[PDB]
Amino acid sequence: EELFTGVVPILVELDGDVNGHRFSVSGEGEGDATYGKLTLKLICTTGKLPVPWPTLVTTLVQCFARYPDHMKQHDFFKSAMPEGYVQERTIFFKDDGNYKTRAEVKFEGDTLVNRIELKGIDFKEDGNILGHKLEYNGWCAHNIYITADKQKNGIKANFKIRHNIEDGGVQLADHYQQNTPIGDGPVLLPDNHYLSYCSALSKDPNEKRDHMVLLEFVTAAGI
Return the closest-CA partner of residue 6 out of 30, 42, 23: 30
Note whether residue 2 is domain-resident: no
CA distance 100 to 177: 10
Cα 82–chain centre separation: 19
Helices (H), the chain: 76-79
Q: How many domains does the chain have?
A: 1
Return the closest-CA partner of residue 158 out of 220, 94, 215, 88: 88
The CATH number for 40's domain is 2.40.155.10
Note whether residue 34 is domain-resident: yes
Burial readout 18-38 (b: 16 or more C-beta within 10 A, e: otherwise): bbebebebebebebbbeebbb
For every residue of 50-76, DSSP letters joined together read: SS-GGGGTTT--GGGSB--GGGGGG-H
CA distance 42 to 26: 6
Helices (H) and strands (E) in the chain, counts: 1, 11
Note whether residue 160 is domain-resident: yes
Determine contact, residues 119/37, Cβ cutoff 8 Å. Answer: no
Note whether residue 100 is domain-resident: yes
Angle in degrees, CA 95, 175, 21, rounded to 5 = 60
Note whether residue 155 is domain-resident: yes
The method recorded for this entry reads X-ray
The pairing of strands 8-18 and 21-32 is: antiparallel
Resolution in A: 2.3
Note whether residue 174 is domain-resident: yes
CA distance 189 to 57: 26
What range defines the domain where residue 65 resides?
A: 7-221
CA distance 25 to 118: 11
CA distance 188 to 197: 21
Note whether residue 20 is domain-resident: yes
> Where is the chain broken, named by the residue before each break, C–N > 2.5 Å?
60
Note whether residue 1 is domain-resident: no
